[PDB]
Design a protein around this ligand. Structure first.
Ligand code: NM4
Ligand code: NM4
Ligand code: ZN
Ligand code: ZN
Ligand code: ZN
Ligand code: ZN
Ligand code: ZN
Ligand code: ZN
Ligand code: ZN
Lengths: 255, 230
């Protein structure tokens, strides 16, 4: 009775902080554990004192059809990320260059996906097998669809190397697309990806994203589906580092 | 002594805030430093259902405001077009629109860089803008401890920080004596450049409106912000 009220109030606080379309629900049908005090919800990167994350894009495209025309990605020297059904078709490691505030195209541009924000309604739920909190979808997620960005406080590689000694299952994500200088820590600050569980068969994958940010030391990190994820299924990402035994039930075992 | 204490306090306020614009603290006038018992807060602090629209174009279609029987508060340029006493029903977390929606202004947070400065005519602290503010545009919410009319009458016994949420109901009052945002420091003017609108976002209970402060005219960079409370 007093647990249901605490979880509902934290749900309501979560839906006040979040700025995207998709709803956030909270569920615990397993134990008496209530809301975490450990967690503050953020929609975008939070700089540590010393980092400056300037959105420094001064030019965009002038396409009337951004799918057919040589667009922002071509200007950056790469392929368009998406098909006309908002699905990514570039391989892992390839950057996403989306249209930005300086482009002429409107919000219906097919190269404006990550920046729309999470479309899917998700549920933070209590796992029934000792893994703590987890995240599931309440709706069908198409293959290769945008789900959510990984956000946190942005820090240096020395801070992240220091903070990592507090015990390779961590909230630290290196933005090491092209530079080893910066890392994302989601331990205090983050969005619903803070609650995602580890798996050796993940249904989420990472891409680097450049919208108004063009500094390649500071890519935004978007998580896309790798297959169809049906209503009810848990979202998983492979964030265990590295011999190495997986700590996922039905493990692969190693790696 | 004074100089170092005010920057510590300034840095504190910018850690605590959850909005985009910066908060500055200046005092070129006297030697007094930070106040003792003021804690900064971003939303209503309580003492001890829902509906979302389905528009593709929230500017033209029958949206959240039309469900409450009223009109869309804002025009293309993000200016309030509705007359005083009219409630603002913003799009909310149950709606089908994203943050592109022209009916999401108050919820986006304080836009402008504000400066808490010491007044040079005995009035204590005050608030001024570091940038020009368009007329009929959102500045910041009034926030504080939310309390009963009963509890507010007892507190009132000691030019007040109490503001009744009496859009429809007499039950609830906002006290910003101890807990508030930079609006806590706004000074009285009998010719104010801020006005109140009642706002409903996730909450639809008209007993508990959120209180947004809009400009009543253009405010130039460096001008002080004021509200008519008395
Ligand atoms: C780039 O994508 C992600 C990266 C992530 O981490 C680098 C995570 C993520 C979720 N996590 C949940 C718990 C957790 N912990 C560590 C201490 C304690 N035991 C619990 C660590 C953790 N990490 C999720 C996504 Cl989607
Ligand atoms: C609804 O909008 C507001 C309502 C407010 O109070 C009703 C105030 C506000 C600021 N104040 C600053 C000082 C002050 N005092 C009381 C005796 C000592 C100094 C009282 C006070 N009130 C500001 C805004 Cl924007
Ligand atoms: Zn284009
Ligand atoms: Zn475009
Ligand atoms: Zn473009
Ligand atoms: Zn495994
Ligand atoms: Zn609408
Ligand atoms: Zn809307
Ligand atoms: Zn709406």
């Amino acid at each position: 009775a007093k647990q249901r009220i605490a979880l509902q109030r934290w749900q309501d606080e979560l839906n006040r902080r979040k700025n995207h379309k998709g709803m956030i629900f909270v569920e615990n049908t397993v134990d008496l554990e209530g809301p975490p005090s450990d967690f503050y919800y953020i929609n975008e990167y939070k700089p540590a004192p010393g980092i400056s994350l300037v959105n420094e894009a001064t030019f965009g495209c002038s396409c009337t059809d951004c799918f057919f025309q040589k667009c922002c990605p071509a200007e950056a020297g790469v392929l368009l990320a998406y098909n006309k059904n908002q699905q990514i078709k570039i391989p892992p490691g390839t950057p996403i260059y989306e249209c930005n505030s300086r482009c002429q195209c409107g919000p219906d541009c097919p190269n404006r996906i990550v920046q729309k924000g999470t479309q899917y309604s998700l549920c933070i739920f209590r796992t029934s097998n000792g893994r703590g909190w987890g995240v599931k979808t309440l709706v069908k997620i198409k293959r290769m669809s945008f789900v959510m960005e990984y956000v946190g406080e942005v820090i240096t590689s020395e801070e992240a190397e220091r903070r990592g000694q507090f015990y390779g299952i961590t909230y630290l994500f290196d933005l090491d697309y092209e530079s080893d200088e910066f890392t994302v820590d989601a331990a205090r600050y983050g969005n619903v990806s803070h609650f995602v569980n580890h798996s050796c068969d993940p249904n989420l994958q990472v891409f680097n994203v450049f919208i108004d940010n063009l500094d390649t030391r500071l890519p935004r990190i978007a998580l896309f589906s790798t297959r169809t994820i049906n209503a009810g299924e848990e979202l998983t990402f492979d964030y265990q580092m590295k011999r190495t035994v997986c700590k996922c039930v039905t493990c692969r075992g190693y790696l």
